[PDB]
Amino acid sequence: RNVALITGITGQDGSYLAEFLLEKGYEVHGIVRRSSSFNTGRIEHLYNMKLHYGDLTDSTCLVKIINEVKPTEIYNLGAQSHVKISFDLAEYTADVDGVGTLRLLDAVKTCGLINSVKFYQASTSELYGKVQEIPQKETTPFYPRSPYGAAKLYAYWIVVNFREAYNLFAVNGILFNHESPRRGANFVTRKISRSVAKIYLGQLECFSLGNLDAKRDWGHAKDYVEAMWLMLQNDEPEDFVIATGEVHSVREFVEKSFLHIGKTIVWEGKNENEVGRCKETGKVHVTVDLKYYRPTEVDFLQGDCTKAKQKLNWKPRVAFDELVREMVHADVELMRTNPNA
Amino acid sequence: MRNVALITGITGQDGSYLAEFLLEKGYEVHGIVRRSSSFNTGRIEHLYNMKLHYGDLTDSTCLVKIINEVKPTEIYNLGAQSHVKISFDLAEYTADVDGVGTLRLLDAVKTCGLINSVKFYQASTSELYGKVQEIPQKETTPFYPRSPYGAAKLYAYWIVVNFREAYNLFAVNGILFNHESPRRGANFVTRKISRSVAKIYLGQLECFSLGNLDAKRDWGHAKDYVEAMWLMLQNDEPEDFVIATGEVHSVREFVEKSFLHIGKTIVWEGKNENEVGRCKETGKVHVTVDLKYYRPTEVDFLQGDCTKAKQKLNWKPRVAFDELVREMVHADVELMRTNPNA
Amino acid sequence: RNVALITGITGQDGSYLAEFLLEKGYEVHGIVRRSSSFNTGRIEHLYNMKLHYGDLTDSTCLVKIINEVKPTEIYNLGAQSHVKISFDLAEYTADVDGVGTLRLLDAVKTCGLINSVKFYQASTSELYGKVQEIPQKETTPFYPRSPYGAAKLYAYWIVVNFREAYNLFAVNGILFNHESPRRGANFVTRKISRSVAKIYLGQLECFSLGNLDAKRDWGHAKDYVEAMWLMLQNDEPEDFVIATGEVHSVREFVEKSFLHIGKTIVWEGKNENEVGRCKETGKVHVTVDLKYYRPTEVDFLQGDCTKAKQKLNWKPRVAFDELVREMVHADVELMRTNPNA
Amino acid sequence: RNVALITGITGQDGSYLAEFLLEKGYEVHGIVRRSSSFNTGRIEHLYNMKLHYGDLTDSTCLVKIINEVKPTEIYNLGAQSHVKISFDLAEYTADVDGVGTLRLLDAVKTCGLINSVKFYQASTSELYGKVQEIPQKETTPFYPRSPYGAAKLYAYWIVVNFREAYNLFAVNGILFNHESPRRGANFVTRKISRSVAKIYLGQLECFSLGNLDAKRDWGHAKDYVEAMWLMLQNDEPEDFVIATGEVHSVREFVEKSFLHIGKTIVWEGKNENEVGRCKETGKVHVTVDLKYYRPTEVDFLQGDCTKAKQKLNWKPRVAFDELVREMVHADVELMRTNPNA
Ligand SMILES: NC(=O)c1ccc[n+]([C@@H]2O[C@H](COP(=O)([O-])OP(=O)(O)OC[C@H]3O[C@@H](n4cnc5c(N)ncnc54)[C@H](OP(=O)(O)O)[C@@H]3O)[C@@H](O)[C@H]2O)c1
Ligand SMILES: NC(=O)c1ccc[n+]([C@@H]2O[C@H](COP(=O)([O-])OP(=O)(O)OC[C@H]3O[C@@H](n4cnc5c(N)ncnc54)[C@H](OP(=O)(O)O)[C@@H]3O)[C@@H](O)[C@H]2O)c1
Ligand SMILES: NC(=O)c1ccc[n+]([C@@H]2O[C@H](COP(=O)([O-])OP(=O)(O)OC[C@H]3O[C@@H](n4cnc5c(N)ncnc54)[C@H](OP(=O)(O)O)[C@@H]3O)[C@@H](O)[C@H]2O)c1
Ligand SMILES: NC(=O)c1ccc[n+]([C@@H]2O[C@H](COP(=O)([O-])OP(=O)(O)OC[C@H]3O[C@@H](n4cnc5c(N)ncnc54)[C@H](OP(=O)(O)O)[C@@H]3O)[C@@H](O)[C@H]2O)c1
Ligand SMILES: Nc1nc2c(ncn2[C@@H]2O[C@H](COP(=O)(O)OP(=O)(O)O[C@H]3O[C@H](CO)[C@@H](F)[C@H](O)[C@@H]3O)[C@@H](O)[C@H]2O)c(=O)[nH]1
Numbered sequence A, C, D: 001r002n003v004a005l006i007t008g009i010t011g012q013d014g015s016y017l018a019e020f021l022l023e024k025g026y027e028v029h030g031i032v033r034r035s036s037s038f039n040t041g042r043i044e045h046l047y048n049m050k051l052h053y054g055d056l057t058d059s060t061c062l063v064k065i066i067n068e069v070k071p072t073e074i075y076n077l078g079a080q081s082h083v084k085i086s087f088d089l090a091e092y093t094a095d096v097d098g099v100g101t102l103r104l105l106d107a108v109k110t111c112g113l114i115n116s117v118k119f120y121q122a123s124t125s126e127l128y129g130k131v132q133e134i135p136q137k138e139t140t141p142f143y144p145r146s147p148y149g150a151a152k153l154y155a156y157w158i159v160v161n162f163r164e165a166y167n168l169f170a171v172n173g174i175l176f177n178h179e180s181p182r183r184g185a186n187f188v189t190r191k192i193s194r195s196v197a198k199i200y201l202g203q204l205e206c207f208s209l210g211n212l213d214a215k216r217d218w219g220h221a222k223d224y225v226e227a228m229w230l231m232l233q234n235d236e237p238e239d240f241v242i243a244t245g246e247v248h249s250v251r252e253f254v255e256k257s258f259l260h261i262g263k264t265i266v267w268e269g270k271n272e273n274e275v276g277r278c279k280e281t282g283k284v285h286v287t288v289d290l291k292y293y294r295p296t297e298v299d300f301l302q303g304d305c306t307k308a309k310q311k312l313n314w315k316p317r318v319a320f321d322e323l324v325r326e327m328v329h330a331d332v333e334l335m336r337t338n339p340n341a
Numbered sequence B: 001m002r003n004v005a006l007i008t009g010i011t012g013q014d015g016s017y018l019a020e021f022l023l024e025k026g027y028e029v030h031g032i033v034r035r036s037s038s039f040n041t042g043r044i045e046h047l048y049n050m051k052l053h054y055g056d057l058t059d060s061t062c063l064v065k066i067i068n069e070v071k072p073t074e075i076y077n078l079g080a081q082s083h084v085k086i087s088f089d090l091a092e093y094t095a096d097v098d099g100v101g102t103l104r105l106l107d108a109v110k111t112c113g114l115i116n117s118v119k120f121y122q123a124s125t126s127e128l129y130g131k132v133q134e135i136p137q138k139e140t141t142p143f144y145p146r147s148p149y150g151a152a153k154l155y156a157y158w159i160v161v162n163f164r165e166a167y168n169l170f171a172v173n174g175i176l177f178n179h180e181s182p183r184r185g186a187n188f189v190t191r192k193i194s195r196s197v198a199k200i201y202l203g204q205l206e207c208f209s210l211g212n213l214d215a216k217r218d219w220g221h222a223k224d225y226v227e228a229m230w231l232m233l234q235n236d237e238p239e240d241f242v243i244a245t246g247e248v249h250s251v252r253e254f255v256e257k258s259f260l261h262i263g264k265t266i267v268w269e270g271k272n273e274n275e276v277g278r279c280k281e282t283g284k285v286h287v288t289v290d291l292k293y294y295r296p297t298e299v300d301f302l303q304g305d306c307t308k309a310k311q312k313l314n315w316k317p318r319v320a321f322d323e324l325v326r327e328m329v330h331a332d333v334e335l336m337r338t339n340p341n342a
């Protein structure tokens, strides 16, 4: 009996995880939000899958769904997941990402599933924020730098407390940045791949970014959802960093993306006056706008996933260069078939 | 001089039409949009005078920030979990958004010192009449809600009344009866029918299932009804108004008329959950009934009397039921032809 | 098997209801709020009674408690019950009095008790607000005049919807004002009885009130909790007005209270300048202060409880004059024994 | 212009802080919860003080109050502060102690007071939970062990984020256990002092406790509220541990408390069968009950307040033995004057 409940099934990770579990013959249940528009674009090709209307702020819907489904595995991926937006939506973010995690854990307990459920929490490298060690591993102290980070920190610790207090098999995947062709359009990697694709097709000339010097450890969502499953296959409930260990700047992401459409970016100017110019044509394609900066930036992330390599035998398959290629190529195809986004 | 609107629910059916209507009048239009993991501004993307702000009706702080920054002259609270069937499984969220959310917005107006400068429109509803206590229903008909949606909207109606009476806020309840359009949510009955009929016409679908075929509704066009919202805020006195067509049709009639527009005459056979709708010309079944689409407490009949609005606002509906059905089926044929996955 | 769960057990009504049910051999459970101070003064003499920490805004505690207790009868008396305070606490009042009622109902459903629980909702004459009929009965249209009234109206209707949708035996007691020596100190009747008692004992000289012309139908809480029980003994779940049918002003309450300590109040002046003077001494004991007025006053309430008389055989035992006497007498004793009481 | 807003003014700390600030000529505002009973016992002797109805779960009331008062200093002491109760009230505790802190900070920002307010957060030694260093100081990593601890951790970090993001003068006082004659009756120290006082006066024979071997660093609330004020007088917004550095067991608190009424406790038995007998009379006065244990106990706390000593010149005046004496003596007087106190 293999029955998964995925919160956040409509998101990037949820959509890949649903595919991965379906291929293994799981019965997959997802919680979807009511919307005035179509909102199941990433999973519509899959309808073994059942969707249920719910929200992580509605305690009764969560108990009803868990009590009806009686899952063997719960993946809490549901969240207001955007860091910049969390500064203007601090309270909603706290209620969904922090308190919502508690609601789900409490529903497990309320439904008498404390000894049968395995629970995965979507923890995050944003917890390290202003990094206290380089690289960051499971024992690096946390230092959040946004309302999102603070809410995720609550979630991390309440999960730990349920494991310790009630012997719930509950784990924190401390996943570093992961991307894909299904990545939200207002995250930096997809913003770049979409804009580069549009420039290639003559639908756009120039776009603006924020902090070009931010550095990230970027992997592929499809690899990372497998690690989530492996953490629940472990005999003991343990927390794990999942990451590539390799660091690149936003600037490098831009450079590599443009090279895939035959353009070499050369930078000129500094800070908010910095521009990225195509060497071959002389045309400006990238500018900087201060409005995209965060009040408290996370400058640098680099994960050490030695523990996961040893215990889970997990290794990332997609490296940064192939990630950039796949994203630009996919968005060229997407924008060619349909110029409207 | 200064005409600045704040629309909650700007991404929805009504919000998108209201935004166009106000922009045409030279308003500066602000909208509150929810964060989503997917694109969610499809009904208003052609418009970007318009500024969008991330917010949620359950986050009191975001609402005060936005109202304090924008300082609107007009607020239209259209934001809601608006689906009645879904409200039975999302009762608490529905209460928090549709009921308490209305209070949050009113309180933000007061907190920001705008009680004497803002005109506030609340999206009230014929669902308030529920198990109807008079036929037709007018402003003085007693309410009798029949869902967690209806109950939440009733709270909202009364808290609006209380702000008007307590603090002299110009605040009004539009008691709007069902209104539809080509932008209507796909899981409301009218659009579900028009989309499914369009798909059948184009060979993309053979058959679809519905719930209670005997429900009766007063159906108008969203584009006409957003004008009434604006007129209620142009009034010298803050008054509540029923807005409706006065004409009643069944779900069954909506199905029949929709199919006639693609050259098919539906004839029904069987009863209750075994009832089917068959094309007379071909003998093929196109409509079945499934109990899962029924509501635990149905609203059987609505018919609005908008005499007060006719007299005071000079508002009259322009689109009648038959033209509404035609426009919806025709628009969804065009939509599904251009894109079979829409 | 007779097992009651009372929300609001620490309040006026809860304390009387708990005694009444205990006398009948019920197992009585109460939900009590955590407080930094002692808060069980009305029920401490009773500890068949079990208390549970909870709150009507905490969905998980309610499911846990209902699932553990498995009550046959639930009395939802828990509320922010003060009308004037509801104007400054509008949202909290909505969450507790409105949404809290839904949470309790949904917990009944979630726990599989929809066909075994009988549910009493504490509805109220405040629903009639700006009265549309005189007297008011079950069929009088509602017209709330406060955030409290609006929240209670939501609660009334969501109860009706659970009864109609799921065949829950759920009822609205539409109780008119009821008082006692245990009445909250900042309601008008108890404010008067305490202040009059203090004046009698030389602990106070004068106090201020708001609208002296408000008129109310006043009964005794001890009689009214019996009606709540009777409504759950009914074969069919029906809503009932409970009231005396007799109307008196705040001014009369003041006059009658002072007569019990040997003072005849004579009024002079109008509106906010009106004062109440003891005829025997010439001393001013009552003034008016605009801060005690409500933005939207409820001027007049008078209940017609014909339906309850016919179907429940309920009749009020304590009339207004005895209510005034009991309250002043009790507060004299209270303030004599303890001047800080 | 010195205007303080105290959330939690009715609690232990709030009541001492209010006195301390009033003595300095502050205008003091407090947020008080609506209650069905009298709940201002600790501050009634003070009414320069203005009280406002509010709740930390009602965002609108908090903005209204802050906008009206325009405080120069805010002390966020309001909380569901009981650790054992937090396990059954996990969600409410998260909403009040965690999200409530954010609501207050956001109201400061919304009201345009980011550059004029100094904000004190009531952080706590419970953040150290399963202690990662002994003694614990500002740089010891946190490890919460309850829903209370997890909620307070959110609050700690969201305060840090407002300081770093918007240059708000905002500080975390990391206060270790502090007690007084006004301590809540269900905390262990006051439970002991009240029960011992009752035994001395013949109002009780025996009481039950939980984990007798837990160890704590106990100081006096009156000393600790002064540190809160000093942290806001600092030129730079800094976080500080406040503690005695001296550790004692619950068992020692029992022994020392009984000594003060002329009784020597001698223990017999183990675990939940352990009892405490008066050596002089042979009578049993203490038993153990498993229901008082916590699912995830905090076994040991010991604070290092070196930083506060150096920068604030703060030193605790009351040591453990005098604290025990003051509490037992005060509760003897209290229970003698009023057996129901
Ligand atoms: N991608 C990364 O680099 C990364 C790294 C570490 C951790 N994380 C975290 O991992 C999880 C998955 O990331 P992602 O990239 O897949 O995020 P995403 O694409 O933004 O997806 C978010 C999902 O959560 C749902 N959601 C939002 N608010 C909700 C609510 N109130 N109730 C129920 N569901 C709600 C969204 O629904 P809608 O579709 O309706 O908006 C969506 O399905 C998130 O928790 C994220 O914070 C991400
Ligand atoms: N159509 C009718 O016949 C009718 C009749 C009377 C009254 N009403 C009411 O009138 C209004 C407009 O109806 P409609 O057909 O335009 O509804 P709709 O298409 O379902 O639009 C609902 C709007 O509310 C927003 N919303 C939902 N939850 C929200 C939250 N928590 N915070 C902020 N915004 C939120 C939606 O955002 P998303 O797009 O992100 O979901 C959407 O923009 C609603 O209040 C509805 O209940 C409708
Ligand atoms: N008295 C009347 O004339 C009258 C008439 C009609 C209806 N009502 C309604 O009938 C009920 C009983 O009236 P009453 O005079 O006994 O009221 P009351 O003395 O004010 O008692 C209210 C009770 O509700 C509890 N409570 C408040 N907030 C709560 C929360 N958030 N979670 C859980 N419990 C909470 C209170 O606890 P604390 O003690 O901790 O505050 C108290 O036990 C109330 O619902 C009231 O609104 C009263
Ligand atoms: N004492 C310690 O050893 C210690 C150490 C470190 C930190 N702390 C923290 O320091 C602060 C002061 O402690 P204390 O011993 O004075 O606590 P306490 O006596 O339990 O006082 C708690 C205060 O918070 C109020 N409160 C609770 N929930 C509230 C809500 N939802 N909205 C508004 N106010 C609310 C209480 O009101 P009611 O009176 O109505 O319940 C009370 O005034 C607390 O934040 C506590 O968690 C305590
Ligand atoms: N979104 C965005 N980011 C930009 C832009 N210009 C520069 N940046 C910088 O790129 C960097 C990456 O920003 P981003 O792509 O928006 O992702 P961020 O790191 O902020 O958050 C993502 O990864 C986290 C893992 O650490 C997850 F927890 C979280 O849920 C989410 O999936 C930042 O430093 C940002 O400041 C710009 O125009 N947009």
Ligand SMILES: Nc1nc2c(ncn2[C@@H]2O[C@H](COP(=O)(O)OP(=O)(O)O[C@H]3O[C@H](CO)[C@@H](F)[C@H](O)[C@@H]3O)[C@@H](O)[C@H]2O)c(=O)[nH]1
Binding pocket: B082, B083, B084, B085, B125, B126, B127, B176, B177, B178, B179, B187, B188, B189, B190, B192, B209, B210, B211, B212, B213, B215, B216, B217, B251, B293, B294, B295, B298, B299, B300, B302
């Ligand atoms: N949605 C839906 N409704 C179905 C179906 N089969 C039959 N029906 C019936 O059609 C009728 C219409 O259902 P509907 O189109 O879903 O709209 P409903 O009347 O329930 O609510 C709409 O109109 C209200 C105005 O009265 C608004 F306040 C509300 O926000 C929303 O816009 C019902 O009687 C329903 O039971 C069916 O398959 N889907």
Ligand SMILES: Nc1nc2c(ncn2[C@@H]2O[C@H](COP(=O)(O)OP(=O)(O)O[C@H]3O[C@H](CO)[C@@H](F)[C@H](O)[C@@H]3O)[C@@H](O)[C@H]2O)c(=O)[nH]1
Binding pocket: C081, C082, C083, C084, C124, C125, C126, C175, C176, C177, C178, C186, C187, C188, C189, C191, C208, C209, C210, C211, C212, C214, C215, C216, C250, C292, C293, C294, C297, C298, C299, C301
């Ligand atoms: N509390 C209070 N009320 C005052 C004062 N001076 C005059 N009044 C008037 O007395 C009248 C009675 O005020 P009251 O005693 O505060 O009770 P109110 O009628 O507002 O509410 C009580 O009864 C309701 C039943 O209809 C319950 F639902 C509700 O929960 C609560 O138990 C009002 O018209 C008020 O304006 C005064 O100084 N305090």
Ligand SMILES: Nc1nc2c(ncn2[C@@H]2O[C@H](COP(=O)(O)OP(=O)(O)O[C@H]3O[C@H](CO)[C@@H](F)[C@H](O)[C@@H]3O)[C@@H](O)[C@H]2O)c(=O)[nH]1
Binding pocket: D081, D082, D083, D084, D124, D125, D126, D175, D176, D177, D178, D186, D187, D188, D189, D191, D208, D209, D210, D211, D212, D214, D215, D216, D250, D292, D293, D294, D297, D298, D301
């Ligand atoms: N309350 C209580 N505690 C008991 C009992 N028997 C043994 N104990 C033990 O005493 C110890 C002290 O329990 P306590 O007196 O309940 O205080 P605790 O340390 O749990 O919490 C207090 O101090 C914290 C600082 O660390 C504050 F953050 C918090 O707000 C609060 O003021 C525990 O180990 C407990 O298990 C007993 O019967 N009741």
